[PDB]
Amino acid sequence: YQEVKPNPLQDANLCSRVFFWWLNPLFKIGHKRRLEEDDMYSVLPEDRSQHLGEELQGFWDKEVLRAENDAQKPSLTRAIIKCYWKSYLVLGIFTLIEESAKVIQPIFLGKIINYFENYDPMDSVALNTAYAYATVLTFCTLILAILHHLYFYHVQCAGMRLRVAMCHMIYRKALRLSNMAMGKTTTGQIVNLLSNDVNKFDQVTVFLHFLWAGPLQAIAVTALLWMEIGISCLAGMAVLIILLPLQSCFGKLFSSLRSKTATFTDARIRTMNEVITGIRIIKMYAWEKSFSNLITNLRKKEISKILRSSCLRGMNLASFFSASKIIVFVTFTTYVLLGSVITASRVFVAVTLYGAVRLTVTLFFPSAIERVSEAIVSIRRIQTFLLLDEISQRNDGKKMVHVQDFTAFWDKASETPTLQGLSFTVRPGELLAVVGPVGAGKSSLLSAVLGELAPSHGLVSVHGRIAYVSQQPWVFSGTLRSNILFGKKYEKERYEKVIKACALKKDLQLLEDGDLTVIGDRGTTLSGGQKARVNLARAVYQDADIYLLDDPLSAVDAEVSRHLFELCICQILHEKITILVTHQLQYLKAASQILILKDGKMVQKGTYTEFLKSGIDFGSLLKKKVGFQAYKNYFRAGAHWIVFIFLILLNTAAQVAYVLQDWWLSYWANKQSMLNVTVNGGGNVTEKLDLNWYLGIYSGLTVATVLFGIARSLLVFYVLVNSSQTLHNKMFESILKAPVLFFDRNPIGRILNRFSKDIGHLDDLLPLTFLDFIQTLLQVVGVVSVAVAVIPWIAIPLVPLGIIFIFLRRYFLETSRDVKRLESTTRSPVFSHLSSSLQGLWTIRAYKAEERCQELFDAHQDLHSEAWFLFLTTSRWFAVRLDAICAMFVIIVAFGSLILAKTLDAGQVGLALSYALTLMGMFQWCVRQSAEVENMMISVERVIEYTDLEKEAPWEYQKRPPPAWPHEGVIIFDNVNFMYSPGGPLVLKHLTALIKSQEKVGIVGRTGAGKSSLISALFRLSEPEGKIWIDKILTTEIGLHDLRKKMSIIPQEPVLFTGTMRKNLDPFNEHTDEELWNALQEVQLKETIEDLPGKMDTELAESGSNFSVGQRQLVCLARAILRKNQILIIDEATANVDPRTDELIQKKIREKFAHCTVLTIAHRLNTIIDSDKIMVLDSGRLKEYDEPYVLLQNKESLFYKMVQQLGKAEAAALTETAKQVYFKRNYPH
């Protein structure tokens, strides 16, 4: 724990805490360089982990008394409520002064609105009394703008505290476990409910306080608007009592979808895994045509079901913007029809109020109804999880282990105990050998000695420290030295002695950094034997009194195991209590005592000498930023630019019809009080405005908004869902015809991440974010336009703010990237701290180390908590500097309009002031959407980068051979060379061979000599060098499928694909069922398939797991027989094959392929000596090419040495059958 740079919040006043002035050095540092983990600030030292964990644990433990004294029901929510209710109302007085300054504001606006109607003479007194009204209006909006971010931050800070308090108490509980219950459950859920049950706490507390502040406004504004003109206020409210349950009937219908189409988007990704894991095998089968139709058919229902909710979800965003002119149209058409007058002093006072009461329950109060059950469903689960059960508390100087009549049960449901009357006593210096069959109860006996097994009968006594090693090598994250120490002090001499006695010198010499290299989970880098070795070394390093070994020597070979035994067990622990368990009887001669277990009963206990005189046999008992190019490419991939121009025109004439909609309200108000009032003084006229002319125009103009909203929110979605439909087809038909070399570079994990993650982000998340930005940007351009097209004196003092705003954005959006990247880096150093501890906790509590289990977890919690405050206080710095340019524009539009009194007639005064009052609140939401768009735009690169992959050659080229090809198969190799990569190491070096008609020529060589490369060049897997001539026709002039369909191959690893056997044997349905049945009877697999009810349509599992390797080899042989090709190739098909089915396959290929040219490559020499000629390949070069018998006469040959290497009798039988077939072929008479 280093004294890093603390937070300056403690040395700051209230002004710098509100304005976030203490973030200047951090921004200055992040602007000039890159921020790292060593540049973060510390959290408040008041409650890091312990003051938040123990305070919550105390109340929960005290609640147990109030639950046991009555014994009715346990409650966990009560402990949470009685803990934070002490300070919850101190923050509830801030929601009463701030949320109430939005109702008095229209009251003050109306007092200035109705002032210009009496300024005929000089009335400075009336201006003197209005100066206060024009000052309170601009003074009230200051608190409403600069006193909201602090409250938001103070509310958001309460969530992370509860999250940390819940995450701290969930780990200390899993140290008093109930293993039988742990065995009943699965460890895949305890670590799982840690990334989803803590994120909801940071959101519910934000809108939870609006519950009692919501309906209050719906009464206050209701009364203030009923005190208006009259009872005509009910028609406008009648709409927003049915508009609320109207959007809830759409969600229920949407819930039927987006859950039904998951049987088409989760069925192709899994199938792609089967076809992409073996492209090396599927490429040379000419089966891409039979498999492309499967994915094409599946890609015929996803988009068709997506565009049945793409409209239902797009019509919802077109109503939220159009509902601002329906509540205003109805309330006036029922007020003008009753008979009254129209003045500008009773219009904007209610129009502005028509939004504050609207955006309170429509968007601000669904969350306090929907985000409550999600934050209460986890509480009724965590409580039950933490209240499962607990364990029973348990604890002459002579160190000894005494066991007398021990009898215990693993589970109470078992009728037969695993241990039946075990009685044995060991002493310091004796070696107790534990041997027995698999499952006799040795490991359970060691666990009982450790005390992990609950004793039902008998008593055990242990005196001293116990060092136990499990059968499965357990290891935690850390270096080798830290793993061996396990909290102990580092002693150079002792460490060297343990390393020498346990033989880690070769392992440290082979590894680069020695014992200082960090090891991940499970120790994947080191082999299991090395893990067992380092575990034994750590166990013996503890210098304990009792040692229990659970098979630590079986994970290595004989020599090293004897080494470790004779140098550690016989020498180091010759004075300690050792109870070792081994299955090898070679180490029982050095053991002082041998105890045998069988079915839980103690057979015999004694030394190795007593077992010898008894005549008992041990063997018998053991046998059973984004550039414009990407945007242009995404815009041009949807359709022609004409639809984009039409959409721009539609948007222009859907935005121009929104500002002009209120122009009629001003034209009607500036005509009623113009000359129609002069009836008593100023004139005498009884005429009035024509009701059948203004109302009709208003109705014809207000219908030009809903009709221009459905045809404006149903084209962008279609374009964006059609572009993704054509960008995927040009990315899938160019990944199956790729070279094999490309697949060997990228792994399977990095090649499957471009078809599941960034394949659906451009369908739902991209359009919903892109449409919400283009409809918000046109909404802010109409607010500055109405303030300049009225008073042409505001455009001059407007360029400094515009210049400041552009420089402020690219001063903040160049540093928040590092803050968000560092948080995600140290986001989860928890999951790999418990997943590797809950699987091997059987020894974490047998060392009395519970003290060093919480301090390590708290260290990883602080590292993550010190990175969340930095991100939470960062967003509150740009939002306090963006509200300072919006709280200045309102003052310069009021004071500049008040000085021009004798220029207007309150019309422009009302218009320009009713539009610049709602700017604060909508100018900050547009910036977050643009940032999200810019952040989600770097994701779409791989879908467009994989669209220009090179190809080798078309499947067919030209001038297919006449229907007489192929023939007997005279193969002529004329200086052919093969290379897996262009310019890489050459594999074949001038191979020249002549294969005659109907001859059996086989390939033999060591591993890596080039056996597979020969068949790879023969099947034209890669373009080879030279001239390879088959059937007197060059293979380069013939297409790939025309060559691959006329040749059959039996690979080394028989890979079978899922589906029916009909498609596996004949995917093109070119053969009849009778031929398939005849082939299956000839391969002798007809009886093994008749027992299944789906003989012709068995649903075969992945990779042929339902059948053995021999059955798969027979299936491939039947496939090659059904192919009826004149060229057969076998490469290591009989290496892992039992001798019976091996000789069966040999007889089958000798009977059916007698007139066919076969290429037999096998590792066993018994399946090659019966061939006509053999090819011994060495380092890619051929050495001898002749019959097997004439080669054996030369003792200096290589194949003779390989034959003699298998033994004397084997080589004798081999040369005997070789001479036999030689005399049979070359001398028939």
Ligand SMILES: CC1=C(CC(=O)O)c2cc(F)ccc2/C1=C\c1ccc([S@@](C)=O)cc1
């Ligand atoms: C600050 C704020 C938040 C916090 C958040 O982002 O979670 C928010 C959350 C929502 F679900 C919806 C809206 C808002 C919002 C301000 C705001 C709301 C509406 C408008 S109107 C123009 O649609 C303008 C601004």
